[PDB]
């Protein structure tokens, strides 16, 4: 059973969320199995950012057991700006554990190196998720995002517990039940960093959303990349903390890393500067 351990108050630099397995903290990056049900294509997704929020929370790569923390820019907490007609993230945003977008090789289909983090997942279900949540989803498609010139695949997924899950099995179903979502998704990842001063991003295949099978192929590739990484065989792991507590055959295995995690110190959400309210029309 997966639960969460929160340190500090949300919206602060001290905020941390570790994922626990039977009350024992594990690495949110390496210790959670990619597959919930491999042959049925059911995955374990780690939710980082709930739909309609702004705080750029993520599984941090350079901290032991890889707790979810808030990203920063120039020493300041990072909040993704509101871009009309969107409000924060338009999907439950997160990642697939045991995956890695290899930065050391130029990916052929995109002609760019990976963005050095687990593959990204867009969960389109009706219910709003919570940070640290490990839910089971089924992949329906994938879009090749080139984020600031880097391979940044976005998987289109749906919680298996969603009332609409049995009716979704491939990408075309998405447009069927969620008309306009894929187009909005394209636009979002194209312009979300413009209010930051960054250039507009671009998509490969003209932003086309590839089907479920294509999605599985990419997911499995990034899984193998992580297999190489965790095995300690990458040419450059970039200082990523490979500490884990469930993989005894790997060189960075350390059961003790779990007990070293302080106890929960959950505090109420800290306030967010009023400027994040701003809706940008860009």
Smallest distance, Å, CB 115 to Mn ion?
4
Smallest distance, Å, CB 215 to a copy of itself?
22
The interface with a copy of itself within residues 65-94 (CB under 8 A) comprises 84-87, 90
Q: Which residues contribute to the annotated binding site for Mg(2+)? A: 115, 120, 152
Return the number of the residue (128 or 260) whose C-beta is nearest a copy of itself.
128
Smallest distance, Å, CB 266 to a copy of itself?
15
From the list 15, 18, 35, 89, the catalytic residue is 89
Residue from 104, 109, 173, 178 binding a copy of itself (CB under 8 A): 178
Return the number of the residue (64 or 92) whose C-beta is nearest a copy of itself.
92
The burial of 152, by beta-carbon neighbours within 10 Å (0-12 exposed, 13-18 middle, 19 or more buried), is given as buried
Which one of a copy of itself, Mn ion, none is in contact with 75 (Cβ closer than 5 to 8 A by kind)?
none
Return the number of the residue (54 or 60) whose C-beta is nearest a copy of itself.
54
Summarize as ranges the residues that interact with a copy of itself (CB under 8 A).
Answer: 51-52, 84-87, 90, 126-128, 177-181, 184, 274, 277-279, 281
Residues with a known catalytic role: 89
């Amino acid at each position: 059973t997966y639960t969460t351990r929160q340190i500090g108050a949300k919206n602060t630099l001290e905020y941390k969320v570790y994922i626990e397995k039977d009350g024992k903290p594990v690495s949110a990056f390496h210790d959670i199995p990619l597959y919930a049900d491999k042959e049925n294509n059911i995955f374990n997704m780690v939710v980082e950012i709930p739909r309609w929020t702004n705080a750029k929370l993520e599984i941090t790569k350079e901290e032991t057991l890889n707790p979810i923390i808030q990203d920063t820019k120039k020493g300041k907490l990072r909040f993704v700006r509101n871009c009309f007609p969107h409000h924060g993230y338009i999907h439950n945003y997160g990642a697939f554990p045991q995956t890695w977008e290899d930065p050391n090789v130029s990916h052929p289909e995109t002609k760019a190196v990976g963005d050095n983090e687990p593959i990204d997942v867009l969960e389109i279900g009706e219910t709003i998720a919570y940070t640290g949540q490990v839910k089971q989803v089924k992949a329906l498609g994938i879009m090749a995002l080139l984020d600031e010139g880097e391979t940044d695949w976005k998987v289109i997924a749906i919680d298996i517990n969603d009332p609409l899950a049995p009716k979704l099995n491939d990408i075309e179903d998405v447009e069927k039940y969620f008309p306009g979502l894929l187009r909005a998704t394209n636009e979002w990842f194209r312009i979300y960093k413009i209010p930051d001063g960054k250039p507009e991003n671009q998509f490969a295949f003209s932003g086309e959303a590839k089907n479920k099978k294509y999605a599985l192929d990419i997911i499995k590739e990034t899984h193998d990349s992580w297999k190489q990484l965790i095995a300690g065989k990458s040419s450059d792991s970039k200082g990523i903390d490979l500490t884990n507590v469930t993989l005894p055959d790997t060189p960075t295995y350390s059961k003790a890393a779990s007990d070293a995690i302080p106890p929960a110190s959950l505090k109420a959400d800290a306030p967010i500067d009023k400027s994040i309210d701003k809706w940008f029309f860009i």
